[PDB]
Amino acid sequence: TGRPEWIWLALGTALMGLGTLYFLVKGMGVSDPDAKKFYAITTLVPAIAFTMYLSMLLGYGLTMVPFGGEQNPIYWARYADWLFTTPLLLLDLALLVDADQGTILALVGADGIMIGTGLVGALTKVYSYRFVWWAISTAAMLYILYVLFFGFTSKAESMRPEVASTFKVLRNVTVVLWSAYPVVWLIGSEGAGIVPLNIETLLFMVLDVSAKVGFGLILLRSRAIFG
Amino acid sequence: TGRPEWIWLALGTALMGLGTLYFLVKGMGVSDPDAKKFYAITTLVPAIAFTMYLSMLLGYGLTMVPFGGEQNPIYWARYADWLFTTPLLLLDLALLVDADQGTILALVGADGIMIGTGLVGALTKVYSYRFVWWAISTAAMLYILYVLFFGFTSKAESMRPEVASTFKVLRNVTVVLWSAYPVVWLIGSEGAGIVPLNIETLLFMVLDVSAKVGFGLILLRSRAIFG
Amino acid sequence: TGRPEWIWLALGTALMGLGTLYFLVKGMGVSDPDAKKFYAITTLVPAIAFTMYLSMLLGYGLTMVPFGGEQNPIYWARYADWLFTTPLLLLDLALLVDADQGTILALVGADGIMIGTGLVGALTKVYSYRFVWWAISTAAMLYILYVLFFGFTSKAESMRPEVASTFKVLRNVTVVLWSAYPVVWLIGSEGAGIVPLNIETLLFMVLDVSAKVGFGLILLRSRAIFG
Numbered sequence: 001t002g003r004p005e006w007i008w009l010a011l012g013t014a015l016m017g018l019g020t021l022y023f024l025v026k027g028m029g030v031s032d033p034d035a036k037k038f039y040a041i042t043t044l045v046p047a048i049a050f051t052m053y054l055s056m057l058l059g060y061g062l063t064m065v066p067f068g069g070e071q072n073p074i075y076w077a078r079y080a081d082w083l084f085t086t087p088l089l090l091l092d093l094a095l096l097v098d099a100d101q102g103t104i105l106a107l108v109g110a111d112g113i114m115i116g117t118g119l120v121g122a123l124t125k126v127y128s129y130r131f132v133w134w135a136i137s138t139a140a141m142l143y144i145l146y147v148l149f150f151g152f153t154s155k156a157e158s159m160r161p162e163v164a165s166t167f168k169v170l171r172n173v174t175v176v177l178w179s180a181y182p183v184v185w186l187i188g189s190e191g192a193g194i195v196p197l198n199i200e201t202l203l204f205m206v207l208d209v210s211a212k213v214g215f216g217l218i219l220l221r222s223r224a225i226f227g
Numbered sequence: 228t229g230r231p232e233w234i235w236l237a238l239g240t241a242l243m244g245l246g247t248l249y250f251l252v253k254g255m256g257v258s259d260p261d262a263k264k265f266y267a268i269t270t271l272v273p274a275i276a277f278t279m280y281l282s283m284l285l286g287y288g289l290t291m292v293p294f295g296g297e298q299n300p301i302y303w304a305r306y307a308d309w310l311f312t313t314p315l316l317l318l319d320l321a322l323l324v325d326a327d328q329g330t331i332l333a334l335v336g337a338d339g340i341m342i343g344t345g346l347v348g349a350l351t352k353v354y355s356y357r358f359v360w361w362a363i364s365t366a367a368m369l370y371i372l373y374v375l376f377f378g379f380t381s382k383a384e385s386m387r388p389e390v391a392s393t394f395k396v397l398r399n400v401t402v403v404l405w406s407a408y409p410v411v412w413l414i415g416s417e418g419a420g421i422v423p424l425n426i427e428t429l430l431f432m433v434l435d436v437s438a439k440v441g442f443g444l445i446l447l448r449s450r451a452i453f454g
Numbered sequence: 455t456g457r458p459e460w461i462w463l464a465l466g467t468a469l470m471g472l473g474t475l476y477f478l479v480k481g482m483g484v485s486d487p488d489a490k491k492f493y494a495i496t497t498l499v500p501a502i503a504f505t506m507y508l509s510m511l512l513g514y515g516l517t518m519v520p521f522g523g524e525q526n527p528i529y530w531a532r533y534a535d536w537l538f539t540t541p542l543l544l545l546d547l548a549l550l551v552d553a554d555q556g557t558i559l560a561l562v563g564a565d566g567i568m569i570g571t572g573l574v575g576a577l578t579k580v581y582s583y584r585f586v587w588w589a590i591s592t593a594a595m596l597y598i599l600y601v602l603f604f605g606f607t608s609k610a611e612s613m614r615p616e617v618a619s620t621f622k623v624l625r626n627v628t629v630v631l632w633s634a635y636p637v638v639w640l641i642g643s644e645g646a647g648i649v650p651l652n653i654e655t656l657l658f659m660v661l662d663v664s665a666k667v668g669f670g671l672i673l674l675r676s677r678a679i680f681g
């Protein structure tokens with residue numbers, strides 16, 4: 001159930017909000033129309049995660065789903081967060097590496113499915129079926145990382161050294177971080193309960209703040225984002 | 228509860244639908260690819276408000292939320308309306324003043340949060356917490372008006388006189404109208420019941436029709452929208 | 455109720471998934487940045503329909519709505535599908551014929567309403583009112599077909615012969631297919647039960663696979679999609 005993890009949600013909520021503040025109060029005197037963009041996408045990610053973590057802390061983003069043979073505590077807010085948050089992150093990588101609108105659209109449709117499917121997977125009452133949805137979502141995810149790692153890196157080799165290198169850093173970080181989510185989900189309170197909801201939230205809190213604030217920090221503090 | 232306000236919802240529904248008709252049957256012989264755009268965004272706002280007001284009149288957009296210590300009548304349809312309607316309005320101002328894609332994205336993310344947060348605020352069961360959400364939403368809103376008023380106006384000074392002036396009119400109107408919503412909400416049936424749901428709907432009906440039809444009229448009837 | 459149509463949903467789910475696979479494993483060695491786009495939009499349509507059909511087969515996309523004087527089986531998943539699927543289809547026609555951003559935005563707002571209204575129509579408890587929503591949705595739809603048929607065709611006459619002709623084929627197909635949905639809906643289990651949910655699903659399954667996979671096949675297998 002949901003109560004003892006309140007602390008990881010409260011600390012997650014705080015780091016998001018400050019993460020939003022620092023990024024906001026940093027990109028104010030930025031005139032470069034490109035940087036101005038990078039700040040917008042990057043600043044919006046924590047602003048969203050903030051509202052959603054806060055909803056979990058206040059107990060709104062928590063619902064109870066019956067499966068297996070019991071009433072399970074499912075934090076749906078996570079997906080309302082990820083749904084807009086993951087695409088924005090993808091967009092940061094795309095502008096940086098200057099991706100084709102056709103590939104951006106594909107990655108954005110791949111992503112929406114990943115979360116959409118992951119949300120359905122978290123609310124399905126037939127315990128067994130949840131894993132079917134987990135599969136479809138993890139497949140979609142790999143598609144995204146295959147393109148980010150191989151496809152994008154290729155597009156990064158035609159940009160100036162600052163960009164190619166910052167992209168490299170960002171690329172390694174998303175690929176490692178992203179693949180943690182599905183594992184955490186599979187062993188958490190949405191799949192096979194091998195790990196308590198207590199620790200699960202402590203894990204998703206580290207994985208999030210790193211992917212949202214961490215990632216923003218790496219990028220925003222480089223010159224890779226200028227013309 | 229919801230019944231005695233049926234008349235403000237029925238008259239709101241009518242003004243929206245006619246508002247859609249007049250704008251539609253006005254921009255038909257428009258060839259200018261820019262005006263053609265302004266009509267599209269501007270015409271869609273009332274078309275949406277129509278469907279949503281109609282849902283309130285038909286009782287679908289009304290739900291009952293328990294808080295404080297009673298069952299409260301909450302018209303959720305408003306946000307399903309605003310969520311797409313406010314961003315479109317923002318887009319009208321942006322094309323007019325020729326804003327950066329980075330600022331448009333920021334204002335659109337600021338807006339989505341404002342309504343998203345406002346929706347959560349209207350459905351939260353812990354009476355006290357509703358105001359927390361009200362705060363976050365009103366903060367987001369001010370961000371939007373700060374940019375519209377100071378930021379955009381600045382971008383309007385480099386456009387031809389017709390545009391700068393029409394923008395001025397539009398700018399004053401949105402800033403005054405927008406700031407009424409949060410006040411109406413705070414004193415209405417979603418916050419502290421100082422005002423009955425009866426009058427509340429009469430207020431939101433004036434504020435809406437003015438912001439959607441009124442605003443469209445001001446703009447659409449000027450030459451500010453041409454090349 | 456929902457059980458005997460499981461077979462049309464299972465066969466629909468399969469044709470979607472394979473439809474996704476074939477399109478995916480076809481557009482891999484495509485370098486043309488335009489084709490690369492057409493594949494993205496076109497490939498995403500079946501990928502979405504897949505997830506949604508699967509949700510119906512697994513029973514998640516089915517809900518029970520009380521109206522008339524009974525409990526009715528309503529597959530809401532259809533609209534979660536159509537909402538993103540129809541706009542993508544519209545986008546295929548638009549890029550092909552090179553439409554104005556103002557018209558694309560109008561058709562996309564027209565479409566969102568059509569499904570949005572159609573969804574409301576399927577969940578409204580006042581039997582009679584459902585038809586009101588059906589009307590608004592069918593009106594929106596005609597608007598879309600009026601533009602596709604007359605407006606777009608006009609834009610197609612200034613493209614090379616391969617495009618104008620492929621567009622013609624695509625145009626006839628969408629206009630005939632699209633207009634079947636509202637009729638099927640009116641006589642199905644969402645309106646007047648003249649037809650059993652059994653056959654209704656067999657009809658929507660043919661109409662979908664044709665509109666999504668069929669349409670993609672026609673387009674994707676022509677050179678109309680290259681520069």
Ligand SMILES: CC(C)CCC[C@@H](C)CCC[C@@H](C)CCC[C@@H](C)CCOC[C@@H](CO[C@@H]1O[C@H](CO)[C@@H](O)[C@H](O)[C@H]1O[C@H]1O[C@H](CO[C@@H]2O[C@H](CO)[C@H](O)[C@H](O)[C@H]2O)[C@@H](O)[C@H](O)[C@@H]1O)OCC[C@H](C)CCC[C@H](C)CCC[C@H](C)CCCC(C)C
Pocket residue numbers: 048051059060061062063064076079080081083084119290291292310311314332335336339340342343344346347350
């Ligand atoms: C413009 C765009 C193009 C924007 C589109 C935005 C929109 C479509 C995003 C949707 C995102 C999705 C992923 C989230 C939905 C998940 C869905 C499955 C969950 C839905 O449930 C929550 C929903 C409704 O809340 C409820 O109100 C109903 C009506 O009154 C009730 O019937 C429900 O029951 C009620 O649910 C709540 O309460 C339940 C309580 O039950 C009780 O529990 C207590 C516990 O102590 C006790 O046991 C009681 O006895 C028992 O009864 C609880 O269980 C439920 O979980 C729930 O709390 O909420 C609406 C959420 C809102 C939509 C979130 C928005 C997210 C943020 C703000 C988005 C910011 C986005 C912008 C758009 C991004 C910009 C970037 C772009 C430019 C790219």
Ligand SMILES: CC(C)CCC[C@@H](C)CCC[C@@H](C)CCC[C@@H](C)CCOC[C@@H](CO[C@@H]1O[C@H](CO)[C@@H](O)[C@H](O)[C@H]1O[C@H]1O[C@H](CO[C@@H]2O[C@H](CO)[C@H](O)[C@H](O)[C@H]2O)[C@@H](O)[C@H](O)[C@@H]1O)OCC[C@H](C)CCC[C@H](C)CCC[C@H](C)CCCC(C)C
Pocket residue numbers: 275278286287288289290291303306307308310311346517518519537538541559562563566567569570571573574577
């Ligand atoms: C393409 C894009 C990128 C598009 C995305 C669009 C989408 C994500 C927008 C979502 C917008 C959000 C903000 C609205 C959701 C708010 C949410 C909290 C409220 C959800 O509830 C409503 C929902 C479901 O209705 C219900 O069906 C369920 C399943 O069958 C039931 O379990 C629910 O209970 C039921 O809820 C209804 O009935 C309740 C009745 O209870 C009873 O009351 C009576 C009273 O007399 C009596 O007491 C009974 O005894 C008692 O039981 C009632 O209380 C509930 O309130 C409710 O009526 O509805 C779906 C709504 C649909 C999604 C609205 C769409 C809006 C319009 C058409 C959008 C047009 C948008 C286009 C996309 C814009 C284009 C522009 C772009 C280009 C920028």
Ligand SMILES: CC(C)CCC[C@@H](C)CCC[C@@H](C)CCC[C@@H](C)CCOC[C@@H](CO[C@@H]1O[C@H](CO)[C@@H](O)[C@H](O)[C@H]1O[C@H]1O[C@H](CO[C@@H]2O[C@H](CO)[C@H](O)[C@H](O)[C@H]2O)[C@@H](O)[C@H](O)[C@@H]1O)OCC[C@H](C)CCC[C@H](C)CCC[C@H](C)CCCC(C)C
Pocket residue numbers: 063064065083084087105108109112113115116117119120123502505513514515516517518530533534535537538573
């Ligand atoms: C980034 C974008 C800009 C993306 C935005 C995406 C988002 C906004 C799309 C929304 C689309 C809309 C149209 C779908 C919503 C329809 C709505 C009316 C229906 C909502 O209900 C379903 C929802 C919640 O499920 C439920 O969880 C709640 C919380 O725990 C519960 O309170 C609910 O009751 C529960 O509902 C389920 O279970 C019910 C069961 O009742 C029982 O029935 C059994 C039967 O045997 C028995 O009788 C039991 O006794 C009885 O109690 C059942 O009746 C309900 O129907 C339901 O199953 O589900 C969330 C769905 C999720 C949002 C779908 C996503 C769709 C896909 C994956 C989208 C891919 C999109 C990308 C974004 C496209 C990319 C292209 C762009 C670039 C253009």
Ligand SMILES: CC(C)CCC[C@@H](C)CCC[C@@H](C)CCC[C@@H](C)CCOC[C@@H](COP(=O)([O-])OC[C@H](O)COP(=O)([O-])O)OCC[C@H](C)CCC[C@H](C)CCC[C@H](C)CCCC(C)C
Pocket residue numbers: 016017018020021024025027028030031032033036037039040041043044047048050051327329330332333336337340363366367370373374378
């Ligand atoms: C604890 C908190 C997390 C809780 C708060 C609630 C929160 C959840 C809601 C907040 C809304 C949030 C979504 C906003 C995100 C904004 C972010 C995406 C912005 C990124 O930034 C993008 C820029 C767009 O730039 P421009 O205005 O167009 O400048 C043009 C210039 O003239 C150069 O032109 P040239 O190119 O031709 O040379 O934002 C515009 C730049 C502006 C001109 C300057 C704005 C300054 C700010 C108003 C002040 C900084 C913020 C404050 C310290 C406090 C934050 C609270 C918030 C509510 C305002």
Ligand SMILES: CC(C)CCC[C@@H](C)CCC[C@@H](C)CCC[C@@H](C)CCOC[C@@H](COP(=O)([O-])OC[C@H](O)COP(=O)([O-])O)OCC[C@H](C)CCC[C@H](C)CCC[C@H](C)CCCC(C)C
Pocket residue numbers: 243244245247248251252254255257258259260263264266267268270271274275277278554556557559560563564567590593594597600601605
């Ligand atoms: C009471 C009502 C509110 C209830 C109704 C239900 C309602 C909720 C649903 C309605 C759908 C609604 C969302 C539609 C909004 C549309 C709006 C955004 C349109 C704005 O307008 C944008 C234009 C796009 O223009 P184009 O076609 O591409 O023209 C190109 C030309 O050749 C010049 O080219 P050049 O630049 O190279 O020189 O719409 C295309 C222009 C067309 C070519 C002309 C269209 C004419 C109309 C079909 C007729 C006018 C409407 C009718 C009187 C009745 C309205 C009912 C509605 C259902 C159709």
Ligand SMILES: CC(C)CCC[C@@H](C)CCC[C@@H](C)CCC[C@@H](C)CCOC[C@@H](COP(=O)([O-])OC[C@H](O)COP(=O)([O-])O)OCC[C@H](C)CCC[C@H](C)CCC[C@H](C)CCCC(C)C
Pocket residue numbers: 100102103105106109110113136139140143146147151470471472474475478479481482484485486487490491493494495497498501502504505
């Ligand atoms: C049964 C199934 C339906 C169930 C599966 C679950 C499913 C629901 C979820 C799947 C996700 C799905 C949404 C993905 C849709 C993708 C689709 C829209 C893609 C359309 O395609 C768009 C391209 C973008 O191209 P690029 O990478 O940018 O190439 C640039 C080149 O260098 C030329 O540059 P130049 O222009 O300058 O000359 O996708 C990128 C091209 C890549 C570089 C090549 C990718 C190859 C694929 C990874 C392998 C093909 C797929 C596999 C056989 C199996 C499919 C399973 C799926 C999970 C991966």
Ligand SMILES: *C\C=C(C)/C=C/C=C(C)/C=C/C1=C(C)CCCC1(C)C
Pocket residue numbers: 082085086089114115118119121133134137138141177178179181182185208211212
């Ligand atoms: C908030 C930032 C990031 C980096 C979020 C990423 C989220 C995912 C990669 C989620 C993936 C999932 C999978 C692959 C399996 C089903 C459940 C998840 C949605 C958690």
Ligand SMILES: *C\C=C(C)/C=C/C=C(C)/C=C/C1=C(C)CCCC1(C)C
Pocket residue numbers: 309312313316341342345346348360361364365368404405406408409412435438439
């Ligand atoms: C339909 C047109 C307009 C101009 C709608 C504007 C809506 C807002 C500015 C809503 C603001 C809110 C705040 C600031 C506080 C919480 C509740 C609201 C969503 C009503």
Ligand SMILES: *C\C=C(C)/C=C/C=C(C)/C=C/C1=C(C)CCCC1(C)C
Pocket residue numbers: 536539540543568569572573575587588591592595631632633635636639662665666
């Ligand atoms: C999946 C592909 C297509 C071509 C889907 C098209 C869907 C429609 C044209 C739906 C139209 C409806 C109307 C006009 C009436 C109310 C109910 C519907 C949503 C089925």
